[PDB]
Amino acid sequence: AKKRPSVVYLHNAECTGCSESLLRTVDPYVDELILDVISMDYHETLMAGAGHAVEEALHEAIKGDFVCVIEGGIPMGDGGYWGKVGRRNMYDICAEVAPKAKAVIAIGTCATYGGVQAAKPNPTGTVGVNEALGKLGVKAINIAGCPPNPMNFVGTVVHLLTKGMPELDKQGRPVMFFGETVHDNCPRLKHFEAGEFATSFGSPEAKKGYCLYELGCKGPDTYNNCPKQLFNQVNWPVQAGHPCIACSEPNFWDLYSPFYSA
Amino acid sequence: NKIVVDPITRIEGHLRIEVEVEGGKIKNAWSMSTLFRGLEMILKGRDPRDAQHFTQRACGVCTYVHALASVRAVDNCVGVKIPENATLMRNLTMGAQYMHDHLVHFYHLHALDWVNVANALNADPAKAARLANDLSPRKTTTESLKAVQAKVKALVESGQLGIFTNAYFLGGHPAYVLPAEVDLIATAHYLEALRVQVKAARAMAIFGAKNPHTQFTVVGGCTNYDSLRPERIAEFRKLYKEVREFIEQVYITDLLAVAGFYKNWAGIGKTSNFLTCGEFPTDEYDLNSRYTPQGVIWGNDLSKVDDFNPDLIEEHVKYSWYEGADAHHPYKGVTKPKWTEFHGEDRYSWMKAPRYKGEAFEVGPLASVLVAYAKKHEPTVKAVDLVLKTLGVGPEALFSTLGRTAARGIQCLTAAQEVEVWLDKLEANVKAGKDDLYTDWQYPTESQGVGFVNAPRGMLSHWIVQRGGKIENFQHVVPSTWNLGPRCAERKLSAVEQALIGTPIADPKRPVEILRTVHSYDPCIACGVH
Ligand code: SF4
Ligand code: SF4
Ligand code: F3S
Ligand code: NI
Numbered sequence: 001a002k003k004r005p006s007v008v009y010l011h012n013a014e015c016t017g018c019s020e021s022l023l024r025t026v027d028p029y030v031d032e033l034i035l036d037v038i039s040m041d042y043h044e045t046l047m048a049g050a051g052h053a054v055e056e057a058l059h060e061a062i063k064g065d066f067v068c069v070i071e072g073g074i075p076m077g078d079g080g081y082w083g084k085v086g087r088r089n090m091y092d093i094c095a096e097v098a099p100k101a102k103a104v105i106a107i108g109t110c111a112t113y114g115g116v117q118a119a120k121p122n123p124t125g126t127v128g129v130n131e132a133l134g135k136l137g138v139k140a141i142n143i144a145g146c147p148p149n150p151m152n153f154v155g156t157v158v159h160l161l162t163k164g165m166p167e168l169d170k171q172g173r174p175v176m177f178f179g180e181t182v183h184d185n186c187p188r189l190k191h192f193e194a195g196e197f198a199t200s201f202g203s204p205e206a207k208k209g210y211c212l213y214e215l216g217c218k219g220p221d222t223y224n225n226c227p228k229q230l231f232n233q234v235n236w237p238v239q240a241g242h243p244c245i246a247c248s249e250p251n252f253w254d255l256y257s258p259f260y261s262a
Numbered sequence: 263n264k265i266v267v268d269p270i271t272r273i274e275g276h277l278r279i280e281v282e283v284e285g286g287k288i289k290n291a292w293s294m295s296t297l298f299r300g301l302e303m304i305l306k307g308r309d310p311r312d313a314q315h316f317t318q319r320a321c322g323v324c325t326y327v328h329a330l331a332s333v334r335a336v337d338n339c340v341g342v343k344i345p346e347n348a349t350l351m352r353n354l355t356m357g358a359q360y361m362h363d364h365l366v367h368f369y370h371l372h373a374l375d376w377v378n379v380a381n382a383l384n385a386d387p388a389k390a391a392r393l394a395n396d397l398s399p400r401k402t403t404t405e406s407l408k409a410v411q412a413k414v415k416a417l418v419e420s421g422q423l424g425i426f427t428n429a430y431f432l433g434g435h436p437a438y439v440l441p442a443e444v445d446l447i448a449t450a451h452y453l454e455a456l457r458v459q460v461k462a463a464r465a466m467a468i469f470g471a472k473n474p475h476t477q478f479t480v481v482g483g484c485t486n487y488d489s490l491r492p493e494r495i496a497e498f499r500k501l502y503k504e505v506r507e508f509i510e511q512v513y514i515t516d517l518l519a520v521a522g523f524y525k526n527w528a529g530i531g532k533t534s535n536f537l538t539c540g541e542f543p544t545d546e547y548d549l550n551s552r553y554t555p556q557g558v559i560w561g562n563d564l565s566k567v568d569d570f571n572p573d574l575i576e577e578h579v580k581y582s583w584y585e586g587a588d589a590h591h592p593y594k595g596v597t598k599p600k601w602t603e604f605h606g607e608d609r610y611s612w613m614k615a616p617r618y619k620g621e622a623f624e625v626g627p628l629a630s631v632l633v634a635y636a637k638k639h640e641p642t643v644k645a646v647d648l649v650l651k652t653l654g655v656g657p658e659a660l661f662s663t664l665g666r667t668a669a670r671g672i673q674c675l676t677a678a679q680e681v682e683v684w685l686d687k688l689e690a691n692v693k694a695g696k697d698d699l700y701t702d703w704q705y706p707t708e709s710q711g712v713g714f715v716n717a718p719r720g721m722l723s724h725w726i727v728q729r730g731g732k733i734e735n736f737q738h739v740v741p742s743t744w745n746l747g748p749r750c751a752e753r754k755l756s757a758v759e760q761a762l763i764g765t766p767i768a769d770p771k772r773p774v775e776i777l778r779t780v781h782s783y784d785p786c787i788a789c790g791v792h
Contacts, residue, residue, distance in 0.1 A: 001421035013297055015788045016274045017322030020474045023366075024460060031456050035413070040424045044269055048374045050777055051267035053428030075297075081601060083297040085269050085276055090297075116319040117299040123599065124299060147322065147474055201485045202345075202700030231472030232464045234497075240471035240478045240486040245315060253316070258309050 004039040005161050006064050008097060011044050012072030012090045013083045013117050013126050017147035018108035019045050019071060025150040026233060028158065038157070041066060044085075055086050058097070067157060068101040070094065070140070073110040073117065074132050075124040082124040091132065098133045103160055104140040106130065107153060109248060112142040112172070119253035130172070141165075142172040145224055145248035149231065152177050169223070171250055182244050183219035185227035188212065198241075206241060216260040217243035224248045263289075265770050268296070270780055272371045274323040275787020277746065279776060281762060288776075291755075291762035293746040294604075295613040295791045298583070302597045302792060305736045310336045310711075310728050311481055313736055317724065318475055320740065321788040326359055326466075326476040327717040328789075331724040331738070334713025336481040337546070339726050340705065344483035344546065345698030350688040351469050351484045353542040353553075354498075355476070356715075357681040358466035361505055362473075363718040364674040365462055365513055367784055369455040372667070373448060375778045376520050378431040378438040382445035383414060390443035397447070397519055400511045410450040430772040437774045440523055448520065451512055458508045465501035468494060484699040495689045502685065506678050517671040518652050521664060528655055531663030531761045531779055534561040535621050536629030539570055539723065541716035542680065553680055554642075554716065557633035560621075562661055567636040572712065572723065577614035577739060581748040584614065589751065592725040593710065595737040612791040613747035615756065616739045624757035625720030625744045626783065627673040628666045634676065641679060645672045663761065666782040673718075705731040717741055719784050742790035745783045758783050 011019070023030050034040050041061040047054050074090050075082030083090035098104050106112045106129035117126040130140040143152050156174055159166050166174045183189070191197065191211035198206035199214055206215075213220070219227075222244055230236045237244055246256035268278035276297045282290035301316055308316075314332035321328070330352060337344065387408040394402030417423055431438045440448075463473040469489050471477035478486040488494065521527075540549050540556030549556040549570065557567045573591070580587040583600040590596060602609045623629075634642035649668055650656065659665060691697075708729045715722040720741030727735040745757045755763075758780060765775050 003420040003422050006422075011276075013299060015319050015321045017319065017325070017474050020322045020325065023456070024463060024473070026460065029457065029460075031453055034425065035417075039420075039422050041422070041427070043425065044271055045274065046370065046425050047271045048379070048426045049428035049430055050271040050773075051269060053430065053772070054269070054271060057427045081603075082299075083276065085296070087268060087278070087604075116301065116304070116316060119304045119316070121303065123303050126299075146319065200700075200702070201480055201482060202698070202702060206485075206700075207487050207697065232460075232467035234464055234467045235471050237471050237477040239488060241488065242471060242477045242480070242485045245477075253304075257312055259315060260309070260311050 004037060006041045006061060006066035007038050007069060008041055008058065008061055008066050008101065009043040009069045010071065010094065010097065012070060012094070012111065013075050013124065014072035014108070014110055015116070016045065021147035022150060022153060024232060025154045028154050033154070062097050062100050066101050067160060068098050068104040069107060070098065070104060070111050070129050071107045073114045073126045073128050075126045076132055077125045094133055095136055098138045099136050104129070104138055105143060105156060106140040107143050108148055109144050109146040109252065112144050113250040115146065116253060140172070141168060141174060144171070144173050144178060149226070149229060151229055152225070173223070177225050178223045178248070180223065180225070181219060182222045182224050182226055186219050186238055187227070188238060201241070212238065212243045215243050216258070216262065218246040218256050219244040221256070222246040222249055265773060267773060267776055270777070270785065272374065272781060273785045274321060275785065275790065277780070277785050277787050279780060281776060283767065283770070286766045288762045288765040288767065291759045292610055293748065293756055293758055295611040295747060295787050297787065298599065298612040298791050300597060300599065302737050305733055308733050309731055310339070310726055310733050310736070313733065314479065317738065320792050321786055322474045323786060324359070324363060324717055324719060324789060325474040326355060326470065327715050327722060329476050329479055330356065331713040331715035331722050333479040333481060333483055334715065335711045335724040335726045337483065338713055339709035339711025339728050340481060340703045342482055342701050342703045344701050347688065347691060347696065347698045348483035348700065349543065349546060350684055351486065351489070351699065352479065354681065354684050354688065355466060355469045356541060357677055357684070358462060360674055360677040360718055361509065362459060362462035362466060364670055365455055365509060366459045368513060368517060368671065369452045372781050373452055375774055375781055376440065376524060377448040378440055378445050379414065379426055379449055380429070380431055381438065381440065381442045382449050383411065385411065385442035385446035387411065390446040393443055394447060398511050398515045407446050407450050410453065411446060414449065430774050435772055435774060436768045444519060444523065448516060451516060455508070455513070458505060461501050462505045465498050465505065468498045480700065482700045482703055487697065487699060490692050490697055492689065492692065495685065495692065499685055502681060509674060509678055514671055514675065517668060518649070521653060521668055524664065525653065527778070528659040528662045528664035530765060531661065531666055531782065532763060533624045533661065533757055533761055535559070535618070535623040536632050537570055537618060537623050537625060537721065538630050538633045539714035539716050539721045549714070554630060554676065555634055555637045555639055557637060559629065559632050559636060564632055564636040564657060567633065574619045575616060575739065577616045577743070578750040579614060580751045581609055582611055582614050583609050587751055592723070592737050592739060593727060597737065611748045613743050615748040615750045616743045617750045617754070620752065622754050622756055623744055625741045627669040629720065630716065631669040631672050632660070639676070641676045642672070645675055663779045663782045719786060720744065738792060740789040740792060742786045746785050746787070746790055
């Protein structure tokens with residue numbers, strides 16, 4: 001035992017968008033990271049053992065100084081029996097672990113706000129991380145977006161063990177990344193202000209880069225950094241002439257939809 | 263006499279597999295899909311234009327694919343004819359999903375059931391290293407492997423093995439049978455393929471908007487106009503190429519080497535009944551217009567092969583946590599959960615049980631590479647013909663967990679190749695001065711729609727019944743729902759269930775075999791259960 005900071009990665013009612021998106025870090029590569037940087041003490045997608053052997057792992061793991069990473073949001077449901085691992089409910093595994101970490105960090109709009117599963121009627125009645133582990137004194141830092149963009153995560157944890165508890169916004173999101181809206185930093189701004197919009201995807205305007213307000217774009221009411229860091233170091237939704245759907249706002253699914261209007 | 267191994271670690275989703283043993287052999291397997299969200303429920307009464315977004319969130323390992331079957335399903339209830347340019351983008355992108363998905367599934371999710379990271383610390387660099395070049399038309403310098411070794415040496419020196427912590431090959435396991443040299447070769451790649459995987463995704467971002475979870479498709483299909491610049495049609499190819507070299511000079515070789523030292527596995531994995539819808543359509547209303555042939559294979563007879571008919575496919579419950587026991591074909595399916603606690607009312611899984619005709623059927627690449635094979639698709643054979651040889655087996659050896667596993671390298675080949683044509687084709691018309699993406703459409707008073715995607719794990723199909731531009735029913739059956747997932751009313755076991763049976767296990771306390779068969783089927787429970 002020693003080396004780098006123990007990290008416990010928990011997978012609740014997720015879809016693995018957030019874990020996959022993580023493997024996409026650059027600068028801090030996943031190898032550098034998972035090796036010379038952090039110490040992924042528990043992570044069900046990459047663990048070499050299975051079942052029992054890993055349960056033992058977590059157990060020992062959550063004994064030290066560790067950072068919890070919770071992907072997903074919890075089915076508190078009509079019991080909370082919608083998600084079970086090792087035969088135990090996802091709430092329970094969470095009530096156990098979260099509370100013991102120097103710091104917890106909820107990844108993706110599911111962990112954070114409640115995600116896809118939590119959309120009407122929310123049959124599983126799933127809710128966000130620190131809206132469930134709150135009563136247990138958990139105050140997680142939200143790395144929003146469906147999924148969040150490597151650096152927002154990585155940069156966030158780096159910030160932890162380096163400087164400290166990052167300044168956060170109203171929705172518990174690091175201001176150092178979710179400060180500005182999407183619109184604020186979008187290129188088709190020009191057209192927004194000038195009044196030049198596309199009225200259809202297959203149209204001269206659309207093809208020449210007209211703003212998407214019309215088509216449904218939600219950059220206006222969405223705080224993210226996409227326009228400026230951008231995905232896979234090569235693109236973004238709008239750059240691909242597709243409306244922004246507010247994938248990092250507390251209730252996009254049911255709020256900012258229909259996603260092809262307003 | 264049951265062994266239980268919940269969770270199934272290196273997969274996607276929450277899978278619990280319970281096995282019963284009778285003197286070294288599995289005697290009863292159970293596939294217990296353990297979490298539920300219920301998107302089909304969430305979807306009720308929304309604009310079918312939205313759908314493609316929700317469902318895409320079925321999962322993220324197999325990103326985009328649920329987008330596709332969704333664009334495609336409305337396009338179908340609307341009856342749009344998307345600019346073949348759009349057809350090009352969409353199949354272009356799917357192609358990378360294959361490249362990425364599979365690259366990262368052998369190494370990063372399947373390897374460790376074979377490789378003995380530990381073992382490697384022995385291995386003579388100069389030795390393993392000299393082995394390399396013999397196996398790959400790529401010069402692997404002693405320095406390389408020699409590094410890898412120290413990089414892992416420093417994994418013991420740290421006190422923390424993190425990922426490897428309670429590893430099944432720790433202190434050697436009888437079932438790990440690899441020359442320390444080979445492990446040092448495997449591992450060295452494992453670690454590289456962690457780098458490539460970025461690129462395989464960087465390129466998919468190009469058309470795709472961002473990786474993971476895609477944003478560039480629409481009913482009327484595609485919106486990414488910018489990706490048409492040659493300036494950008496170049497940037498893809500260059501990635502495309504390098505990801506292809508890796509896959510060819512490296513993923514393909516290793517599957518082969520390892521598959522070598524594990525030839526006994528070619529005799530285990532009991533499956534019959536395969537089917538596919540085909541993928542990479544050239545005309546969107548013809549399954550027969552697809553690059554990879556659509557076909558059905560009953561039992562193991564690679565000589566029949568009849569047509570895929572989506573009329574006789576109805577999910578089941580009975581041993582699923584949903585009300586009642588009666589079955590329904592998608593277009594008329596229901597989704598209201600039960601939950602009886604575990605084996606309650608005999609129910610064990612959140613996944614419905616999609617029975618084909620009446621029979622279980624195993625979808626995915628095996629089924630794919632069998633269907634192709636049984637139908638001249640040249641590149642497919644040329645591919646197996648060599649495997650089957652390098653190995654030195656026959657067709658029936660393909661029917662095993664070694665088959666199932668092997669086939670997946672080939673599928674990723676009989677796709678990595680093709681991608682070459684589509685990009686070109688696209689770059690042609692662009693040069694022409696044809697940039698048609700998107701077609702104008704309108705909602706019929708009411709209509710039905712169905713879109714078939716042959717996802718990296720198989721036959722995906724979304725199915726919409728819309729009334730006035732609002733969803734009246736948008737149910738979906740996903741690959742893993744076929745492969746993993748309960749028994750039917752006719753209690754017929756499932757692809758994997760049967761695959762587990764008879765599997766010998768050398769050490770219950772560390773059952774690598776349970777995992778070698780379950781991982782060969784690339785289980786994706788988030789999809790499966792949706
Ligand atoms: S936040 Fe989005 S990408 Fe992340 S697990 Fe949830 S649905 Fe998937
Ligand atoms: S495309 Fe969207 S985010 Fe960009 S300027 Fe227009 S409305 Fe704002
Ligand atoms: S859709 Fe989400 S990924 Fe960024 S461009 Fe808009 S906040
Ligand atoms: Ni998936």
